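URGENT: need a sanity check before tomorrow's submission.

F., can you look over the YTH domain-containing protein 2 record below? I want to be sure the sequence and structure line up before it goes out.
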Amino acid sequence: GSSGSSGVRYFIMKSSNLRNLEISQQKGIWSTTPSNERKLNRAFWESSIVYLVFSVQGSGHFQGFSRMSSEIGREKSQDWGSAGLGGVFKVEWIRKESLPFQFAHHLLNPWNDNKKVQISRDGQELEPQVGEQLLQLWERL
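Structure tokens as predicted:
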């Protein structure tokens, strides 16, 4: 028969504050730790798309998600909250609505002690099985 070899991945990106995220909404870019960039880069090259679910540590909701549009490096920006950065990349914003955890309260991640999706550190790989059904949620809003 047939089988899907290539596919988009899902990475959870946490944000200290909200403002910092605004830059990604206006400038259309995002800068993450150089310890979780590789994946985003490689994956983007080994995958058709790269879904990155952004979330603010504070707010108990999902700031949303954006599919990587450009690789990390060549792209550079200035405006930012945390100077401690190295490697900026673009990102396509799909949903900007705040989704209540309650919605993704049933969804979990069997990749890390089957811990609730939300329960993911910055730059953490999210299973494509739970990361896909987690986005569609924004469609139920």
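My own read: The CA atoms of residues 104 and 134 lie 6 Å apart. Strands lie at 9-15, 29-31, 50-56, 61-62, 64-68, 88-95, 99-100, 108-109, 115-116, 124-126. If you see anything odd, call me.
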